UniProtKB/Swiss-Prot annotation:
It comes from Calloselasma rhodostoma (Malayan pit viper). Residues 1-68 form the Disintegrin domain. This is Disintegrin rhodostomin. Inhibits platelet aggregation induced by ADP, thrombin, platelet-activating factor and collagen. Acts by inhibiting fibrinogen interaction with platelet receptors alpha-IIb/beta-3 (ITGA2B/ITGB3). The lineage of its organism: Eukaryota, Metazoa, Chordata, Craniata, Vertebrata. Disulfide bonds join 4-19, 6-14, 13-36, 27-33, 32-57, 45-64. A motif (Cell attachment site) lies at residues 49-51.
Amino acid sequence: GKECDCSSPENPCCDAATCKLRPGAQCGEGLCCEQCKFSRAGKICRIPRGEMPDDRCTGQSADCPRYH
C-alpha cells in the first residue's frame, strides 16, 4: 500500500519509522530496482529452467511479478 514500500528495517533507502522511502528513491528494494530507482522495461527479473518464458520487468515495476 502506501504505508510501507520497504520491509528492510536497515535499508538506507527506506525509513523504518514509516517503512517507506526516505530519500527521493522510487523504491527501497525490489527485483527490478536499480539504486532504489525503478529499473527500465526489458529487465529480466526471473529465469525459467526447463521450458518457461523469462520475466522482464516493465521498467516502471520495481518488484517482479509472474508470467506463466
